[PDB]
Design a protein around this nucleic acid. Structure first.
Ligand SMILES: Nc1ncnc2c1ncn2[C@H]1C[C@H](O)[C@@H](COP(=O)(O)CP(=O)(O)OP(=O)(O)O)O1
Ligand SMILES: [Mg+2]
Ligand SMILES: [Mg+2]
Ligand SMILES: [Mn+2]
Ligand SMILES: [Mn+2]
Ligand SMILES: [Mn+2]
Ligand code: NA
Ligand code: NA
Ligand code: NA
Length: 327
DNA sequence: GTCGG
DNA sequence: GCTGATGCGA
DNA sequence: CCGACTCGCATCAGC
């Protein structure tokens, strides 16, 4: 549906193969960087040489593009799709909690299908049992309309705990996406700063409240600053119950909000791009701060930030609306 | 797999 | 039973 | 040529 969708689809499938089967994370990132830069290219690619002009597209990817443009397919991908071990590992990783290591371990023991997981559920940990339970739901997209209803529940229940919590839905939702893969929530409270003593139960109070009104249905991981779990909109009068959804909550110091919003909003590739430019400009950006870089390349103190645009200003970038960060 | 060095 | 090692999602 | 490309949380192997 995009200018170079056939090429970027091929590159994404090759990326997932290198992550799930080969366990070569830098190849996975290399394919993703190539797909992202091609996705931003304003012309329809006619040759591998044309794509090779783009940063991140090298000899082999340009060669794969020429084959795909000539034959409409890739022999390398067709061999992968046919390899029983490769496609089995590739499938098992679609279960949340089953990564490349567990997928390879299961497949070696003849555990390679969904029904194999159900039959061998005793060998799954709690996370994997949940990922298997909601396997279909977790692959459904969340229409933005439903994200607004979820945002209403989250922000309202959070206010019910304490008036001074601030909850901001980030991720693809804040980037204006018509559909989202999950709900990502950033949480702050005046009592938690970078200079304050650990106030526990700050995130626990919010998670407990969302559980009490039956919004959060299951927990995958839960600590003092990060919650990973499952949520579900309420359904009306025995009508079609909603699909269960993944939700992430991150509690960050209030004085590092805007660096947190910038990171949590994404995209992941955009963050990689922005942080790469920051180093070319004498700064280093992470999830919490932007710091200067000295003559020796050492990181200074966190710089003052009171807006997302403040971070763009430091590295001398034109401000990008969250809508234009989906890279 | 790519690119800078 | 505890500690270090490792996998997981992001 | 070749080396570069973060963390909180859950679990469990190895004592
Ligand atoms: N591999 C990674 N490691 C660390 N941080 C990462 C990350 N990938 C993404 N992020 C950051 C930026 C995302 O906006 C934000 C959410 O990451 P995410 O997994 O929720 C993907 P998102 O951009 O929200 O779209 P969608 O598929 O859910 O509709 O977290
Ligand atoms: Mg042009
Ligand atoms: Mg249910
Ligand atoms: Mn079977
Ligand atoms: Mn998300
Ligand atoms: Mn998320
Ligand atoms: Na690699
Ligand atoms: Na190139
Ligand atoms: Na998985």
């Amino acid at each position: 549906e995009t200018l170079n969708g056939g090429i970027t689809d091929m590159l994404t499938e090759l990326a997932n193969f290198e992550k799930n089967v080969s366990q070569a994370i830098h190849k996975y990132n290399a394919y993703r960087k190539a797909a992202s830069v091609i996705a931003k290219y304003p012309h329809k690619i006619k040759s591998g040489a044309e794509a090779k002009k783009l940063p991140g597209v090298g000899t082999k990817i340009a060669e794969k593009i020429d084959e795909f443009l000539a034959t409409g397919k890739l022999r390398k991908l067709e061999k992968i799709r046919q390899d029983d071990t490769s496609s089995s590992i590739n499938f098992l990783t679609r279960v949340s909690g089953i990564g490349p290591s567990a997928a390879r371990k299961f497949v070696d023991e003849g555990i390679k299908t969904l029904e194999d997981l159900r039959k061998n559920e005793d060998k799954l940990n709690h996370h994997q049992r949940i990922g298997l339970k909601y396997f279909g739901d977790f692959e459904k997209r969340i229409p933005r309309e439903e994200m607004l209803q979820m945002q209403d529940i989250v922000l309202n229940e959070v206010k019910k705990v304490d008036s001074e919590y601030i909850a901001t839905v980030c991720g693809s939702f804040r980037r204006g996406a018509e559909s989202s893969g999950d709900m990502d929530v950033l949480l702050t409270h005046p009592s938690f700063t970078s200079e304050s003593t650990k106030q526990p139960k700050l995130l626990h109070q919010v998670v407990e409240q969302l559980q009490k009104v039956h919004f959060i249905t299951d927990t995958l991981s839960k600590g003092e600053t990060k919650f990973m779990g499952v949520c579900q909109l309420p359904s009306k009068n025995d009508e079609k119950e909603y699909p269960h959804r993944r939700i992430d909550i991150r509690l960050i110091p209030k004085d590092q909000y805007y660096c947190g919003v910038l990171y949590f909003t994404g995209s992941d590739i955009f963050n990689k791009n922005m942080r790469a430019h920051a180093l070319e400009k004498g700064f280093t950006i992470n999830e919490y701060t932007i710091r200067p870089l000295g003559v020796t390349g050492v990181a200074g103190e966190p710089l003052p930030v009171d807006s997302e645009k403040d971070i763009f200003d430091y590295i001398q970038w034109k401000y990008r609306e969250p809508k234009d960060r989906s890279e």
